[PDB]
């Protein structure tokens, strides 16, 4: 048992490891999109530059959950990172609409992690999710949702 | 159903609309006070300048709840704004003491809105009230409460 | 009777109160439009930013008529502010065309207020409307009228 | 009853006074350590300068709970501050390891105060502990814990 | 016996420890006054800011006697710090008049400590009290004495 | 067939995809080391900061081979990224010595890719490996090799 470990439960530890894998899988899906629009027969460089910055910010989210794991006295266990589902995309609208399906699966998983910390009476872990994760998932879904609107009215 | 709507309940939506009406009613009560002290037979211009800034800050609170309504996928419904209860005030003490009765009705209504979000398991809506609304209602009541003290000493 | 009251008629006083209510109703119609274009399925942020500045300038017009009421020795009487007529708008053209119908009702009401001050021989009240209100209603109608033209060409 | 007192319970008031005494006892334990390493036969001035800054920061924590007591309408009751348990320390490792035992007793007591505010439905008092106290009890224990590691490696 | 200890008597050592306790008791009496005037029904913030700076300067006096104890080869022994005598004060005059009774008990105790060092032929300890302590007790009593005068002529 | 594709062979294409997977596997091994030295019972923060910068530079190597794939008219195919072999490390010497075993497997694989481009007569692909990859693998192995020497002298 670690010397810094206090009010920290084995079930909350295992669920922080599943969230680290899910942020590393999303950083590697935005990387596959950024080099689709970089091709010669696609050639949209405003989308290629947009998803490359989304890939660098999803890695900073994972490193922030790894720093918390050590800071509370837990042990990190890393797993494989699966390849994305889709090799090539139809258009720039089909990519924004699947990037929206992804952010809603990441937000959904942060909500059961908050319901787990509340049931185990872990005040520090609840305030870390609210202060950091939950507020940008609402700003990101709102920003992707109104790109999907503008790209449908251009056909 | 909106494309950005997730973990958002119809009862929490209707209660954000009642709080928007209550912030717009308070911005219009502080406006009626600012032009009472601007009269010729009252002529207190430190109170006229004080309540005019309180009227501009109460609308920024309402516009912040309107931006949240759209950001979570809800629909805003606006109602009438009633006229205040009092046309003219006795003195500068009677105005500070009714401005204190008002801030305690606004704070009371934010507390049942927090108890509603907690019962519906809405982590994002709880942290938005705590981070923004509840801390400024405690600082405002404490500041109005010790003006009422200094104005009683002066008769 | 006030000590500053001179050449000021009871009928001109009551008509300045009806113009204050009509400027506060228009500031709250431009506020309802600004948060229509802020939705997820509308998502036009050049119109959302345009009507939010029109809402802040319509309240400075009302505060300027409240300062005149006190400065001439009259008493302000505030009424209810009714909800707008339309909850949601068809498009960005239908909003510019109703914002034009509104500015022509505000301009029409300033013309009966000028004909009243002229019949009561009130030189100061006539020059206050000409110098402030009437010149900005002609520039605003001319600017809204040629947005309606450009938005019809684009279909 | 105070004029600013709202949604504030007698049991939550008494527990804020016990936390003020516990922060003032810890500021006076770090003061006794800072002048142990300042002796002639000890003479470690990097430890003397380290614990003197920890003593000044523990008093700012107590003054922040005294300002909250007045701001919510409660009354402060001060008690005696006991002398520390240990007059002199064996080495610099024995002092870091007892300073770690202390921070875990301060953190443990903040967790029972959060469970009390949650049972009494006091949203403002919960967010004040999370935003201020709970996050640097975790940063402080993590920083003291890895000094204890480096000082064991050096014998 | 310390290696730096010279011309230093056991009776002069014990009396420097009683003066350290008396400076720490006075720093904690000025802290209780600073949060009396911070209440809602008292609300004098020029007195609250005045006694908070007097509390920070009384601790610097105690840390200066702790540095001297080590520098001459003596050993510090810390005791309990008793709670003040008075929980709440009548007015701002009753607080200035008790703060004057306190400074005259601190000054009286420095005079018996100077008579002890002179009887034991300790030149360094006499010049440390004269250069530091005795001149500031005469300036402080003179400054508190003429606040008590101005607050009586205001009733 | 792409419109930009010239003097580019299907065997050289498949071997650039295997090198992209091998750079992404190495960026994720240096990430697992950086959070080993960040633990509470390890607590070496000069090694934690060293391997975190090695993880960011291995990702820039992979993005540079992805940009070349598109620029020559090839198609990127991404695979899974395996978990590293070792969960925790014995010491700081055992980590430097395995980081050296890794750089020699990356350098070995770049040499078979240069022998393939030379056999297929692809001048552009040979000069891209020499100018970018091969010179940094010799500087990195030389720098890791003389850390392993200094860490053995210290036991």
Swiss-Prot record, chains A, B, C, D, E, F:
Gene Ontology annotations for the cellular component aspect, listed alphabetically: autolysosome; autophagosome; cytoplasm; cytosol; extracellular exosome; extracellular region; ferritin complex; ficolin-1-rich granule lumen
Enzyme Commission (EC) number: 1.16.3.1
One annotated GO molecular function: iron ion binding
UniProt site positions, description: Essential for association with cargo receptor NCOA4: 18
Tissue and organ distribution: Expressed in the liver.
GO biological process terms, semicolon-separated: immune response; intracellular iron ion homeostasis; iron ion transport; negative regulation of cell population proliferation; negative regulation of ferroptosis; negative regulation of fibroblast proliferation
Keyword presence, Oxidoreductase: yes
Binding locations of Fe cation 2: 58, 103, 137
Keyword annotations from UniProtKB, A to Z: Acetylation, Cytoplasm, Cytoplasmic vesicle, Iron, Iron storage, Lysosome, Metal-binding, Neurodegeneration, Oxidoreductase, Phosphoprotein
Catalytic activity field: 4 Fe(2+) + O2 + 4 H(+) = 4 Fe(3+) + 2 H2O
Localisation: Cytoplasm; Lysosome; Cytoplasmic vesicle, Autophagosome
Keyword Transcription: no
Residues that bind Fe cation 1: 23, 58, 61
Annotated disease: Hemochromatosis 5: A disorder of iron metabolism characterized by iron overload. Excess iron is deposited in a variety of organs leading to their failure, and resulting in serious illnesses including cirrhosis, hepatomas, diabetes, cardiomyopathy, arthritis, and hypogonadotropic hypogonadism. Severe effects of the disease usually do not appear until after decades of progressive iron loading.
Function: Stores iron in a soluble, non-toxic, readily available form. Important for iron homeostasis. Has ferroxidase activity. Iron is taken up in the ferrous form and deposited as ferric hydroxides after oxidation. Also plays a role in delivery of iron to cells. Mediates iron uptake in capsule cells of the developing kidney. Delivery to lysosomes is mediated by the cargo receptor NCOA4 for autophagic degradation and release of iron.
Family: Belongs to the ferritin family.
Subunit structure: Oligomer of 24 subunits. There are two types of subunits: L (light) chain and H (heavy) chain. The major chain can be light or heavy, depending on the species and tissue type. In the human liver, the heavy chain is predominant. The functional molecule forms a roughly spherical shell with a diameter of 12 nm and contains a central cavity into which the insoluble mineral iron core is deposited. Interacts with NCOA4; NCOA4 promotes targeting of the iron-binding ferritin complex to autolysosomes following starvation or iron depletion.
Protein name: Ferritin heavy chain
Protein's organism: Homo sapiens (Human)
Gene from which the chain derives: FTH1
Segment of the intact protein contained: 6 to 160 of 183
């Amino acid at each position: 048992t670690s010397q810094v470990r206090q009010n920290y439960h084995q079930d909350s530890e295992a669920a922080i490891n599943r969230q680290i894998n899910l942020e590393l899988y999303a950083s590697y899906v935005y990387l596959s999109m950024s080099y689709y629009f970089d091709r010669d027969d696609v050639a949209l460089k405003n989308f290629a530059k947009y998803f490359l910055h989304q890939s660098h910010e999803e890695r900073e989210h994972a490193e922030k959950l790894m720093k918390l794991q050590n800071q509370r006295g837990g042990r990190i266990f890393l797993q494989d990172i699966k390849k994305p589902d889709c090799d090539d995309w139809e258009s720039g609208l089909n990519a924004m609409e699947c990037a929206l399906h992804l952010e809603k699966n990441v937000n959904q998983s942060l909500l059961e992690l908050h319901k787990l910390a509340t049931d185990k009476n872990d005040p520090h872990l609840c305030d870390f999710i609210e202060t950091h994760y939950l507020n940008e998932q609402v700003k990101a879904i709102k920003e992707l949702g109104d790109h999907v609107t503008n790209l449908r009215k251009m056909g």
